[PDB]
Structure 1
Amino acid sequence: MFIQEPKKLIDTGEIGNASTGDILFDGGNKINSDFNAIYNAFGDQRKMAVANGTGADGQIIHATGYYQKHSITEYATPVKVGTRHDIDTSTVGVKVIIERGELGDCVEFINSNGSISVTNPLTIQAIDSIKGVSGNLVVTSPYSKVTLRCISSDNSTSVWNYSIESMFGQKESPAEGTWNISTSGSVDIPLFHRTEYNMAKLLVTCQSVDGRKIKTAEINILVDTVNSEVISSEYAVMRVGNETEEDEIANIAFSIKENYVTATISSSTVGMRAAVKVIATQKIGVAQ
């Protein structure tokens, strides 16, 4: 037979305490904190002032990363490591201070509007110091890219070093490598199509398999497109195993072959190697 148990009543005072509500609230907040962290590291932070960076014009993850636009008053306090800044010194130079760092910490600056100049510079103070710099780093190169990295921290020593580069320009090299001079005693090395550059600068170093013979030379070449030729000026020639003070070890000539500015390297010595590298170029663009 059924022997009932006394009356039981649902404790309405236990509809909380680590139950959904508590977990979803604590979870969501954590999730939001993390995403805000990520989005603000790769997106425009100025959007946070609107729906917390949401909406049709809200924050997005830039695969290229993002450089923040901050105000003067905001730079009154040390910047955190890992941040990126797009500096604007249009109305006045700005100073940025970087908090003490640890080995590998980095901070990068960009100058999209090209406001950086000698009168309105970008002054950087990296907590403690910057190597090779007395005091603050003063940047006056417009449209520049400055990267600061901490090269020593341990404890009481926080030292940084920096790099400064142009954001824009044609810096590419059309050719760099090493080629063998075939048994025929000559090798053609295509440098670039006749229409890519008007002028190029290259370094050529030829050495025998045993290093007894070697020559190096710097060459500036001019592309004469109208006559389909290439003028050259070889200088700073240096040789080591030259049998005669007239013995070249290796001759370098230029011309256009198959519409490609081409370097022709030949040598008497057998088993000669030749390193060719284009370290500069100039292309006449459009004025302005």
Structure 2
Amino acid sequence: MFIQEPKKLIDTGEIGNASTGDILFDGGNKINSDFNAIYNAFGDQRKMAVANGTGADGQIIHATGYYQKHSITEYATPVKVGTRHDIDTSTVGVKVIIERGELGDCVEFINSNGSISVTNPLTIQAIDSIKGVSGNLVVTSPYSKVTLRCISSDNSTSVWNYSIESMFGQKESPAEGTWNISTSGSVDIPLFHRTEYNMAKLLVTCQSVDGRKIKTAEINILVDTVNSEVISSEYAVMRVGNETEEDEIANIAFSIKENYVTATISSSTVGMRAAVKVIATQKIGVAQ
């Protein structure tokens, strides 16, 4: 691997005190050291084996950043904080060790070839320990993204915590916000175009400006494109200042309006607010 050297700056404090030969060699090497540190942090380090990362197929600065691809032997020694790794466990699981960190230090991993599995796992050991984990963190989720962050350093108290998430997938939320139920006692909230999703899941919480009346419900909806309708299943309904155990506080209906799956929120109680949030969706794609 390439272990950069800290930042070096040109000592302009000299020059009319050391001739042109020494300042260009002590300056050049300094400029080549820094850039190398920058290009290897945002570029493929494997290219250093050529013209020192130069040439036509040389190193470039990836705006998206870069995740280095190292070998087993290289991971035999603790990795430096701030590095990025694209793990490959196709032939065998790989063990990565992170040097002791300080508050905020970070190391990130990805698995572009999706080799991570239970037989060929990604084992991570963060010098000292990882919260909620006894020993090493064993990652078995293919195509994942792992982020490790030091949440405590001080003296020996060098503890880390982590997050693991999928590199891919449709995770967006087509709608999230708060709307007022107009004086007319009804409000339309467009969620998404009829062609965007087959089903969605949302959370709806209606509350009076005073806070004495409140209702929340979870609703799953199915888009019936053929009949231009939307089926819904409202459950886990909870109410507080409901004057009666009958129809109450706020009603939620669905349909397609202007070609947009839409939520219609109505209420008898004047001055009602309604928070709507889509927390999940499913879209039928192409098999395989």
The answer to whether the Cα contact below 8 Å between 2:79 and 2:98 also exists between their aligned partners in 1 is yes
Please give the alpha-carbon distance, in whole angstroms, between the structure 2 residues aligned to 1:8 and 1:83: 20
Q: Distance in 2 between matches of 1:278 and 1:147?
A: 26
Residues 16 and 22, structure 1, Cα contact 8 Å, conserved in 2? no
The superposition leaves residues 67-121 of structure 1 with CA deviations (integer Å, 9 ceiling, x where unpaired) of 0000000000000000000000000000000000000000000000000000000
CA distance in 2, matches of 1:4, 1:61: 16
Return the offset for 1:247.
Answer: 3.6
Which string of whole-angstrom CA distances, capped at 9 and with x for unpartnered residues, describes residues 124-155 of structure 1?
00000000000000000000000000000011
1:18 Cα shift?
Answer: 1.7
Separation in 1, partners of 2:84, 2:2: 75
For residues 238 and 35 of structure 1, the distance between their equivalents in structure 2, rounded to whole angstroms, comes to 60
Name the SS of the counterpart of 1:57 in structure 2.
coil
2:2–2:45 CA contact under 8 A, matched in 1: no
Greater mean deviation of Cα atoms: 202-211 or 5-14: 5-14
- How far apart are the structure 1 equivalents of 2:2 and 2:264? 107
Regions of 4+ moved over 2 Å:
1-17
CA, structure 1 residues 130+11, in 2 after alignment: closer, same or farther (shift >3 Å)? Answer: closer
Q: TM-score, normalised by structure 1?
A: 0.94
For residues 97 and 4 of structure 1, the distance between their equivalents in structure 2, rounded to whole angstroms, comes to: 18
Distance 1:2 1:33 in 2: 11
Q: Give distance in 2, aligned partners of 1:108 and 1:126.
A: 12
Alpha-carbon contact 1:217-1:238 (below 8 Å) kept: yes
What is the CA distance between 1:16 and its match in structure 2? 12
DSSP-derived class of the 1:124 partner: strand
Distance 1:143 1:10 in 2: 43
Q: Could you say if the C-alpha distance between residues 22 and 240 of structure 1 is closer, same or farther in structure 2, counting changes exceeding 3 Å?
A: same
**Gap change, CA 1:208 and 1:12, over 3 Å in 2:** closer
Q: How far apart are 1:61 and its partner, in Å?
A: 0.1
CA deviation after TM superposition for structure 1 residue 14, in Å: 16
The answer to whether the 8 A contact 1:204-1:218 is kept is: yes
**Matches of 1:4 and 1:167, distance apart in 2:** 28
How far residue 4 of structure 1 moved from its aligned partner, in angstroms, is 59
Residues 213 and 242, structure 2, Cα contact 8 Å, conserved in 1:
yes
Distance (Å, rounded) in 1 between the aligned partners of 2:204 and 2:7: 99
**C-alpha RMSD over aligned residues:** 10.3
Q: Which runs of 5+ in 1 are unaligned?
A: none
What secondary structure is seen at the aligned counterpart in 2 of 1:61? coil
Q: Deviations over 1:204-234 (max 9, x none)?
A: 0000000000000000000000000000000
Gaps of 5+ in 2: none
1:79 corresponds to: 79
1:171 and 1:154 map into 2 onto residues whose CA distance is: 37
**CA distances 1:233-274 after superposition (whole Å, capped 9, x unpaired):** 000000000000004100000000000000000000000000
Q: How far apart in 2 are the matches of 1:3 and 1:244?
A: 70
Q: Is the 8 A contact 2:207 2:214 kept in 1?
A: yes
- The answer to whether the 8 A contact 1:150-1:158 is kept is yes
The 5 A counterparts of 1:156-167 are 156-167=156-167
| SS of 1:41 mapped into structure 2 | coil
Residue 5 of structure 1: aligned partner: 5
Pairwise CA distance, 1:54: 0.2
The TM-score normalised by the length of structure 2 is: 0.94
CA change 1:206–1:6 in 2 (3 A) is closer
Aligned length: 288
Percent identity between matched residues is 100
Q: Distance in 2 between matches of 1:2 and 1:83?
A: 11
Distance 1:15 1:199, change over 3 A: closer
1:35-57 C-alpha deviation (Å, 9 max, x unpaired):
00000000000000000000000
- Aligned pair in 2 of structure 1 residues 12, 242: CA closer, same or farther (>3 Å)? closer
**Residues of 2 paired with 1:148 and 1:80: CA distance?**
12
| Range with greater deviation from structure 2 (3-12 or 206-215) | 3-12
User: Separation in 1 of the partners of 2:6 and 2:84?
Assistant: 69
1:90/1:120 contact within 8 Å kept = yes
